[PDB]
Design a binder for this molecule. Structure first.
Ligand code: HEC
Ligand code: HEC
Length: 648
């Protein structure tokens, strides 16, 4: 009789299927693509999927196929995934922030007078980044990076110089996808790097603030569209989506700002933490709200499109590179747990995971219960091969580990600010009717509208009319931003490693997810020592800072206090928020491109840095409540479930 545990180095199903197989081998089925209407052939099964995959390559009628085919063989996929990884390491997609020489001297902006000899480490510490596992070069003053293979300086993982769309080293530094999407757990002596472990430590606001005070890349230029944060390990990255229609023609990606499609009063979505790329292969949808099909890469393209230096053709023309990025992400598997596991305890956990009804014996009466068996599995997915072969649990064994449930907010009840991001029909319609929704697949679509500002102004008006309930103007595409209803229950493969948890990174360990009463409202992880100069302590990421029992960061609880003399200053209310917490780069970028009053990024002070280094659940969007149906568990059930998660 099949195993309960399923520990695997190779998790990604295409990589499982291609392992040791020649290039010409027909690619394995992507199980995410099986999650379509009809999948739930047993309506009484423990798990009922509700977030369906949408195939944009061969779209439902009346849409037409206009995308190059996805890979059809193991060799095609592997070559694509290699190109994806090279793109992540060397291509400058994300908006450049600073000249290489300004970055070389950025200790000036930290308040140092001369370069400390630990400069390269202090960069990592200050900004919550890591020593990169690849050569990540930038040119020292005087060096021409196109004669010196990028330069002899090295950047941390998370920053990039890279190569522009003409294949040349740019001489400019910005963030990379890895600033948010990647991190090290364990020093490089303790652990190899694996892609797709979301960053718990990055401070996006502090990098933006520092960079803003360097020599402008463009002398008179506008503020840059770049993300901010209230602290570390989450950011307003997703705020970009709301910003997009303010700056860019939504059909052509021409930079042509307009008032007509920007809802300037959509509520701020809060901070979100990056989901884990290394389980992309199990997720039918993108984004914390499950809003888009995982077949789509236009969402993955946002930061490359939002770069102010590209023209409409170049922005749209990033698509091939992003399909290769996407294939690298689907090729990923999570790191395997590096410590000891009690196999028998993990098997008790496996059972609890798949079978224990959290609403059993009248528990959690006040939390609406979804269709299914009330177990972890009824939302997150079925992991156990034994349960995967049982139609009381899963209708198809190929669906093992698939996360395709968006849990309604009335049940999940975690911080709701993020689920309001595209709540307004007007916003979704702007998206639905253009390039973002792949409206080139409409049967009514001819060609891209003209790439010119006058014509872009012409089209804005009937677009806004459609957005507000009027006649169709631009055709609709199949890559619809779904109306939000809740949050995706994400894959727990790899979750051992990815603390802190929930979409806002508010809960520092798995125990806390499992026991709401033990979640600290404010919590501080172990820091590194300050560097030479006495500043830039960072978050320590060595194994000693991780909690191998409760599965998460070691932390010290801290009390909120509105007294101004306290340090770190950690208010009990979002109302006492300081200027660095309230700032929105996206808001001011929009204001400035729309010829409205705008506020430039505040210089973030060292006292504010002290507060950004502690997680505060009281800030807007930062609540640590929710997923409370785990309170019905016993502590014995919780330890078993933790041991089981170690095996995922
Ligand atoms: C922080 C400033 C980020 C940078 C730079 C990039 N990404 Fe990101 N990404 C980020 C967050 C917080 C989220 C979740 C947003 C939300 O609230 O829903 C994402 C989401 C993705 C995803 C989908 C992941 C999933 O749902 O499993 C992908 C595939 C992704 N981002 C890709 C990506 C690429 C390719 C980037 C560089 C061009 C990139 N992102 C930059 C945070 C940030
Ligand atoms: C549906 C009703 C669910 C049940 C039952 C369980 N989980 Fe859950 N989980 C769910 C959602 C929708 C989310 C995302 C919440 C958010 O806003 O972020 C979660 C989150 C977790 C997490 C954190 C995952 C991450 O941060 O990437 C863990 C570790 C987790 N869930 C584990 C878990 C276990 C062990 C359960 C059975 C006891 C369990 N969950 C039940 C949806 C639901």
């Amino acid at each position: 009789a099949l195993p309960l545990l399923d520990q695997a180095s190779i998790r990604s199903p295409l990589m499982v299927g291609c392992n040791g197989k020649p290039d010409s081998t027909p690619l394995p089925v992507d199980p995410r693509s099986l999650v379509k209407q009809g999948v739930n052939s047993n309506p009484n099964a423990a798990l009922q999927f509700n977030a369906y995959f949408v195939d944009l390559h061969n779209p439902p009628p009346p849409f037409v196929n206009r995308l190059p085919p996805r890979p059809t063989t193991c060799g095609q996929f592997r070559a694509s995934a290699t190109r994806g990884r090279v793109n992540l390491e060397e291509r400058q997609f994300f908006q450049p922030m600073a000249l290489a020489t300004s970055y070389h001297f950025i200790f000036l902006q930290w308040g140092y007078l001369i370069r400390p000899p630990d400069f390269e480490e202090q960069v990592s510490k200050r900004y919550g980044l890591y020593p990169a596992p690849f050569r990540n070069p930038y040119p020292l003053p005087g060096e021409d990076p196109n004669q010196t293979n990028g330069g002899s300086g090295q950047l941390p993982l998370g920053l990039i110089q890279g190569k522009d769309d003409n294949g040349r080293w740019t001489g400019l530094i910005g963030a990379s996808c890895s600033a948010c999407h990647d991190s090290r757990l364990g020093t490089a002596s303790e652990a190899s790097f694996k892609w797709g472990l979301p960053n718990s430590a990055n401070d996006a606001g502090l990098l933006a603030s520092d960079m803003f005070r360097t020599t402008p890349i463009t002398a008179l230029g506008n503020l840059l569209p770049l993300p901010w944060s209230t602290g570390r390990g989450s950011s307003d990255a997703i705020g970009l989506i709301s910003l997009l229609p303010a700056l860019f023609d939504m059909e052509t990606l021409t930079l042509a700002p307009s008032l007509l499609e920007y809802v300037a009063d959509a509520p701020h979505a809060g901070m979100t933490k990056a989901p884990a790329w290394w389980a992309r292969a199990f997720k039918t949808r993108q984004f914390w709200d499950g809003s888009l099909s995982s077949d789509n890469v236009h969402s993955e393209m946002a930061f490359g499109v939002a770069n102010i230096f590209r023209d409409a053709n170049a922005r749209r023309g990033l698509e091939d590179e992003f399909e290769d990025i996407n294939n690298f992400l689907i090729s990923l598997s999570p790191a395997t747990y590096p410590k000891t596991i009690n196999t028998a305890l993990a098997e008790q956990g496996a059972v609890i995971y798949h079978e224990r009804d959290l609403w059993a014996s009248g528990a959690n009466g006040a939390i609406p219960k979804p269709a299914g068996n009330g177990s972890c599995a009824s939302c997150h997915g079925v992991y156990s091969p034994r349960h995967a072969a049982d139609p009381n649990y899963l209708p198809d064994p190929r669906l093992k580990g698939v996360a395709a449930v968006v849990t309604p907010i009335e049940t999940i009840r975690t911080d709701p600010r993020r689920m309001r991001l595209m709540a307004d029909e007007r916003q979704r319609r702007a998206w639905n009717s253009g390039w973002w929704a792949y409206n080139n697949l409409s049967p009514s679509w001819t060609g891209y509208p003209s790439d010119n500002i006058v014509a872009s102004e012409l089209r804005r008006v009937p677009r806004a009319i459609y957005n507000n309930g009027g006649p169709i103007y631009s055709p609709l595409g199949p890559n619809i931003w779904e109306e939000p209803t809740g949050y995706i229950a994400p894959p727990l493969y790899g979750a051992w490693a990815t603390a802190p948890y929930f979409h806002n990174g508010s809960v520092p360990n798995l125990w806390g997810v499992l026991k709401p009463s033990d979640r600290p409202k404010l919590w501080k992880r172990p820091y590194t020592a300050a560097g030479i100069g006495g500043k830039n302590a960072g978050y320590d990421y060595s194994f000693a800072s991780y909690d191998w029992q409760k599965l998460g960061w070691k932390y010290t609880a801290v009390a909120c206090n509105n007294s101004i003399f306290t340090s770190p200053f950690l208010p009990c209310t979002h109302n006492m928020a300081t200027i660095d917490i309230l700032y929105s780069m996206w808001d001011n970028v929009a204001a400035q491109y729309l010829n409205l009053a705008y506020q430039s990024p505040p210089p973030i002070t060292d006292q504010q840095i002290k507060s950004r280094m502690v997680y505060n659940s009281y800030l807007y969007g930062n609540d640590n409540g929710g997923h409370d149906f785990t309170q019905s568990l016993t502590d014995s059930e919780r330890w078993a479930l933790i041991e089981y998660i170690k095996t995922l």
